[PDB]
């Protein structure tokens, strides 16, 4: 796709994902998904389809009651911007039951940690593709 725009967006997503980092079924990009340099070489569409699916997965979680429900996010939360950026990126690539309140703060932390790892993988993919493809 548009390697450069994807590279720039994925970089901003990495920044957003760490911006509120506190003091401390799931799509994961696996070895077999071909998001490593050799794999992107041969055929990159597999990787990009896996990244697209990961992005849609996170945007849906961030728009769910885990994040919109109590304890309410503060007005300074970057979850709003993260969500828009995840949508923004998924778009460049191809243009889930109720949670218990007492569990949401921990679920949000776990999802955001997992999101940090995912976005970093995507950022490396788009940077390599931009530089070599």
């Amino acid at each position, epitope marked *: 796709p548009a390697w450069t725009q994807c590279q720039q967006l994925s970089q901003k997503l990495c920044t957003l994902a760490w911006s509120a980092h506190p003091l401390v079924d799931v799509p994961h990009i696996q070895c077999g998904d071909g998001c490593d340099p050799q794999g992107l070489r041969d055929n990159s569409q597999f990787c990009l389809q896996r990244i697209h699916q990961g992005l849609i997965f996170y945007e*849906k979680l961030l*728009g769910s*009651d885990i994040f*919109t*429900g109590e304890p*309410s996010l503060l007005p300074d939360s970057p979850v*709003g911007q993260l969500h828009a950026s995840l949508l923004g990126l998924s778009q460049l690539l191809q243009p889930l039951s109720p949670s218990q*309140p*007492w569990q949401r703060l921990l679920l949000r932390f776990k999802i955001l940690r997992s999101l940090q790892a995912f976005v970093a993988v995507a950022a490396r993919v788009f940077a390599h593709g931009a530089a070599t493809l």
Partner: antibody
Amino acid sequence: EVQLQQSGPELVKPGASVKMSCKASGYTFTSNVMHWVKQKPGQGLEWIGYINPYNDGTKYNEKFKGKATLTSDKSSSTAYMELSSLTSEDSAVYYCARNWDVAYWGQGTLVTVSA
Amino acid sequence: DIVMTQSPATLSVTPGDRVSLSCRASQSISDYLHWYRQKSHESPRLLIKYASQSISGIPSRFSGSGSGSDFTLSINSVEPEDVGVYYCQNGHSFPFTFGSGTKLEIKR
């Protein structure tokens, strides 16, 4: 400024249904869930359920499943509750409320079920 | 379902006095407990959230404490405008549930 404006009082026949609305302003509609709560005249409060407008996901109190249906219209930032097969037991004030911890409830809609 | 029990049902107090309202949960709810007051003809108004956290615009007279199953709302020096029914609420797990209320009456 935040407002949750509910629709007017309603006299409903037993067996009929009624749909009431809660128009939200002054905040991002999709950023909070919208709860509905029942309160019988001079009595306590019961939570009915909520809707999450972004995905239309709902969560009900088991006591109200099948009595209440929550929906939302993002285009008008309005949450709705429809109550089905009404009996005198459903006569009450019904409130809409944002997330509990943000302190905003609608003014209530009084439903009277009578022949 | 978690049952929230409040006591006393009614309280008659002299302004200036300190007041204590109790709320007990049938199961531990950590600090996911909110307090409201509902005055005649109004919707309930959040006073304290998460057991002890203050709410912008509410008098410093009000404070809450407790964690787990037993909670207390304290009014430092009661004022006339405090009259109304005070409810506690399980903000912890489904279904959310409210206590039966304590009606506060003022002596004059």
